[PDB]
């Protein structure tokens with residue numbers, strides 16, 4: 156029906172129909188009379204997968220024959236979402252599959268909704284890994300994503316009586332048609348044991364063995380016939396494990412628990428043994444695979460054929476594991492092995508919050524990984540000898556830079572290990588990378604300035620425009636053609652349409668159509684009744700104090716109080732939508748969800764407010780829900796305290812999809828404003844330097860309460876039970892934190908936020924000028940393609956040239 160979805164040729168549709176029927180009969184063992192909607196989805200998925208396999212086999216052969224440098228992207232999280240539609244998009248099959256399914260009496264969009272998200276990540280870090288795989292394949296790089304096949308991904312969120320409840324995400328229950336088990340590449344991973352020194356060096360002995368079984372998933376590039384691999388490891392017990400008899404067999408579960416569940420902690424490090432086991436498991440299995448593939452081409456060439464990218468410190472044990480293999484097993488001298496290791500590894504940092512840094516207790520590493528601890532101590536001693544020679548007498552610098560932190564419990568600082576053992580260290584937006592050089596890693600920058608880089612984050616325009624917003628993709632394609640989908644800078648050409656009355660109308664119509672469709676989805680799945688003429692004000696992301704959902708809540712209560720004070724005054728109607736998951740042990744984040752729902756309970760049932768203000772908590776925010784809500788948004792809330800959000804990527808998704816942004820000068824917001832023009836962004840609040848100045852004097856929240864009567868009224872409403880009438884003190888923890896212990900200075904940005912929100916409302920009353928500003932944002936969003944990001948990694952870190960040429964079909 157629309158050009159960006161491809162051709163529906165006669166031969167193609169006919170063939171798709173016959174293969175669909177073949178899978179329904181032979182694969183699923185059903186006839187049309189007893190087939191359930193789930194059967195139809197599986198028949199379709201198997202049909203589409205059949206089109207990947209020839210290209211997958213041919214791509215992997217091509218890499219064997221050409222022998223390029225291989226890129227290994229190591230991550231504990233891959234937040235992939237659904238695969239069916241993405242696969243159709245990248246193989247240009249969407250219109251054909253639509254027509255084929257239509258002709259069988261089926262609605263393809265309905266079948267798409269049956270697929271489970273692959274929710275193998277928490278938020279931004281996991282999704283960046285998924286966007287990166289898509290871009291690496293689209294740029295023709297010989298790239299592999301390596302992680303863990305968690306049996307249970309991020310929990311499904313239910314809201315009961317306004318409180319978050321967690322339930323298990325049993326995403327594999329019905330099977331996964333995209334993965335291929337590769338039991339023949341099963342490898343042993345070792346734990347515990349002890350170290351014996353011999354004439355022939357050290358030996359790690361008396362270990363427990365767990366098997367790592369790989370499952371491969373295809374990663375198709377955009378219309379270029381490249382299909383790369385994501386390899387995920389699953390834990391299996393050996394067959395003699397513990398071998399009364401019954402209990403020995405049941406105890407196999409202890410080994411297999413390694414790959415059972417994703418830790419749901421976004422930004423709060425816990426030193427749990429099971430998590431450490433996951434980290435080593437993924438590293439040890441992956442490195443054996445890497446070395447195997449390298450041997451089937453002398454270790455001096457290893458960094459010419461291999462790059463390893465560490466997605467945060469979670470796979471940081473790759474550094475001492477590579478040293479262990481090179482020294483203990485291959486018998487390279489230390490200095491040679493270290494040179495190879497450093498030249499092979501690179502590290503990406505994703506946060507500056509100190510509570511998110513991995514600092515493992517020494518006693519844990521000593522029991523679990525005794526040889527690795529010895530290697531780490533040796534790395535540290537040699538590293539500090541270099542620091543001492545560069546900065547003689549600077550004894551305090553030696554303690555600050557050490558990998559080993561002294562204290563009540565000794566710990567290993569994993570970030571310090573990653574810097575020491577990597578040839579490149581990068582942050583994820585310009586301001587963040589600057590902050591790394593000036594503050595937390597200043598000592599390391601002074602020692603080795605050349606290591607430190609920036610690579611500003613991006614998002615894939617396949618998932619985040621073509622897939623989720625085909626209406627927008629099409630009206631763009633009508634004027635500038637299709638090339639922009641793999642070269643997003645071509646969106647700049649849209650600036651010449653900013654005064655085009657037809658283009659203005661089309662852009663605004665697409666937003667309206669997306670809003671209507673989203674409003675309908677709300678009514679159907681969640682019984683909720685919104686006004687699609689209102690401004691859609693959305694904040695979706697994980698719930699954390701630094702992201703300041705609480706600041707949004709204060710604004711919502713302010714509008715409510717203004718309405719109550721002057722009920723017969725006109726106000727621009729809003730639907731305020733907030734969604735996101737809280738980590739199960741994070742009490743304050745759970746209290747914030749309850750506050751949002753309790754505000755909703757008052758505001759949504761006040762007859763004086765009417766349809767002028769609605770507050771909705773979007774349950775179970777995940778990749779598939781992001782694809783629905785983001786195209787429907789008018790206003791994107793990106794309101795973290797300056798200095799706390801390393802980059803953000805939700806921000807970029809909203810910009811691409813025709814929302815305007817209200818935000819602080821934080822993370823990538825800075826670069827987004829710079830690209831669009833500050834006049835086309837709603838910027839407010841303290842800059843990083845203002846936060847610094849306040850810290851030096853001391854933040855006193857009382858001063859703001861004392862000086863702003865509107866803020867004082869809200870705090871008194873919260874305290875006295877206005878929003879919790881049956882439990883008057885329900886929110887006293889929230890009040891106490893804001894008044895006495897707020898690390899993120901919510902009150903300090905309140906006045907400027909409210910004023911800036913009044914300017915947003917003023918512009919929304921003038922649809923033509925609203926839409927013109929939107930066009931200026933979409934037109935300048937090209938920098939934020941993950942294709943640009945990956946090209947920079949490839950050239951500046953990995954030493955490989957991207958390619959846009961097709962492989963033969």
Ligand SMILES: O=C(/C=C/c1ccc(O)c(O)c1)O[C@@H]1C[C@](O)(C(=O)O)C[C@H](O)[C@@H]1O
Nearest residue numbers: 279280283420421422505583800801802803
């Ligand atoms: O998602 C994470 C961290 C996850 C994490 C930390 C510690 C753990 O122990 C853990 O299990 C997870 O950071 C993201 C990264 C980001 O989306 C990006 O570059 O992609 C940029 C954002 O600003 C955001 O802060």
Ligand SMILES: *Cc1c(COP(=O)(O)O)cnc(C)c1O
Nearest residue numbers: 278279696777778781803804805
């Ligand atoms: C993009 C995305 C995120 C990251 O959003 P931020 O606003 O950058 O934290 C988190 N969760 C999901 C499901 C996403 O798609």
